[PDB]
Amino acid sequence: DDTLSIRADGDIARYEVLELADPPRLAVDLFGVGLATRAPRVKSGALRDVRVGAHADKVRLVLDVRGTM
């Protein structure tokens, strides 16, 4: 209730975090990562929900929110 913690364990990482609105979202981009089946352990950290993808970079994690953070 005080705060939800999202933990990503790996060798890296360079990251960037930013916000989006309509709907309110928090987005993290991780570099030096290729998307993998372990991405599902990500379900632990939603966020109304969490979606993850990649575009020949660079993985993007998107957290829809239930309240301003």
UniProtKB/TrEMBL annotation:
Belongs to the bacterial secretin family. It comes from the Bacteria. The chain holds residues 214 to 282 of 901 of the full protein. This is PilQ. It is found in: Cell outer membrane; Membrane.
